[PDB]
């Protein structure tokens, strides 16, 4: 009876096709008791009634943990003009009103965490102070309307990109941006969400990040290629041994389209079957 938790995302629309909530019980069936959302808009997940959601992950012995939600500008219908991407002192109150509604529905859902995970536009050190800055004000935004974990952020591969000058540019030249992040972010309103695959495809090592900043780490996202184990990539032995001796208590299984053919639920399975019979997840 291990505990663990799935980014619903992995599943893609395969978990809204037919019955949900015979969906959300196969959830269940497969080995998994905590779940972190995706697809949150206006107050429903997926198209869903959010509480008519919860309810029925509920009544199958899921719980709701965590939720991915991204800053939109509601004023546009299409779903990605509608995306704010290029943060400014001028689109601040803007994402501070997103903050606010979004982190009202996810206390309601009673959600503990609530987390960002895409990178808005940086390219440079300043864009990347202005949105540390967004992000430490969001956290303010987030525990006011009583989510107490406050801003968790998730990272791709990009925020290891660095921002280097002219006068500045294998050898390494100029700052990663994600070194930044956990820099100029206030450790007491900011946390991070760890996706340790991303982390490989951003040529850094997430056992060193763990080591290195045991205290701003608090999340994981395991994650491989497709099914876990099935690639030359991930040492999830190290990986587990270094969350436990962190005390980090929370992860989620993520699995991308899968490559061969292959349904969701499918890979999905053999994700919590590895877990389940690797000696080092307890
Ligand atoms: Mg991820």
Known sequence: GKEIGLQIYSLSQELYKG?????????????????ELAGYGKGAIGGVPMM????????????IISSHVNPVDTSISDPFKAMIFKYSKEVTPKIMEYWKA?????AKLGCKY????????????????????????????????GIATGFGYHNHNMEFNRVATKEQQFMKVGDQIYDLMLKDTDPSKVYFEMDVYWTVMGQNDPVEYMQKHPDRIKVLHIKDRAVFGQSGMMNFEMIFKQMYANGIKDYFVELEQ?????????????????????????
Do not use: W
């Open 114 to 145: 609530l987390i960002q995970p895409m990178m808005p536009t940086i390219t440079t050190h300043d864009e990347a102070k202005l949105v540390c800055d967004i992000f430490n004000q969001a956290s303010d935004v987030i525990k006011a309307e």
């Open 258 to 282: 899968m490559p061969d053919g292959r349904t969701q639920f499918a890979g999905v399975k053999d994700c919590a079957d590895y877990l389940i019979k690797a000696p080092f997840v307890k």
């Open 52 to 63: 008519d959601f919860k309810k029925m992950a509920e009544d199958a012995g899921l719980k």
């Open 19 to 35: 019955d949900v909530a015979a969906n959300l019980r196969k959830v269940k069936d497969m080995g998994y008791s905590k779940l």
């Open 102 to 106: 979004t982190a009202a529905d996810h």
